[PDB]
Amino acid sequence: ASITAITVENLEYPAVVTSPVTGKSYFLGGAGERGLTINFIKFAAIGVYLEDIAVASLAAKWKGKSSEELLETLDFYRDIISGPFEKLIRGSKIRELSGPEYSRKVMENCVAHLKSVGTYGDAEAEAMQKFAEAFKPVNFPPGASVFYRQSPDGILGLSFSPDTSIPEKEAALIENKAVSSAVLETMIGEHAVSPDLKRCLAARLPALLNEGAFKIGN
């Protein structure tokens, strides 16, 4: 039919979001849940937004592929993760979480990843320190959100909100190529814990990739 909003555990993810920081417009690629290993306890919801130009970019290699084919093609997610377009990730809590509580397990996966690809030098350790620091003064009562703005120019912007509305400014800009893609790498890349996100993107992209390009209006 047409692109749609996704609701996760009562956390609405709009079909379209426009960034107040770069003016770029994104479309919902998919949403997912993320919880713990104790009974599986769901803690947060996650939505991956891709800039509208991402469609033209992915078109040549992926238009025509079925959702079944996309889901199994690791190379599909590498074009999503490292594609020449901005990505926006919004994590919204189901269960209250302080900055550090949350930033804790996010940095875990990120540090691991960077280590397994040989890109975790001082610069990378420094950037992750700035990342931890941006989360310290923040708290995430259910409904509250963190917006990771992954710039194509190697910037990772960090925004925090009381609800699911997008902030007008960012609390921090982390300038490191490897780290900029790390967060998205941990959610939809090869060694992603939960399939939820990868499955959702495989499901909703085929419809789009076939309509050529896609511009979220003037």
Curated annotation (Swiss-Prot):
Keyword Mitochondrion among UniProt keywords: no
UniProt KW Transmembrane keyword: no
Catalytic activity, reaction form: a chalcone = a flavanone
Signal peptide from the UniProt entry: none
Pfam families in UniProt: Chalcone (PF02431)
EC number, UniProt record: 5.5.1.6
Site (Important for catalytic activity): 102
Keyword annotations from UniProtKB, A to Z: Flavonoid biosynthesis, Isomerase
GO MF term set: chalcone isomerase activity
Mutagenesis / variant outcome for changing residue 102 to F: Strongly reduced reaction rate
Function as written in the Swiss-Prot or TrEMBL entry: Catalyzes the intramolecular cyclization of bicyclic chalcones into tricyclic (S)-flavanones. Responsible for the isomerization of 4,2',4',6'-tetrahydroxychalcone (also termed chalcone) into naringenin.
Additional free-text comment from the UniProt record: Part of the biosynthetic pathway for all classes of flavonoids, a large class of secondary plant metabolites, many of which are brightly colored.
Protein family (similarity comment): Belongs to the chalcone isomerase family.
Name this polypeptide is given: Chalcone--flavanone isomerase 1
Record organism: Medicago sativa (Alfalfa)
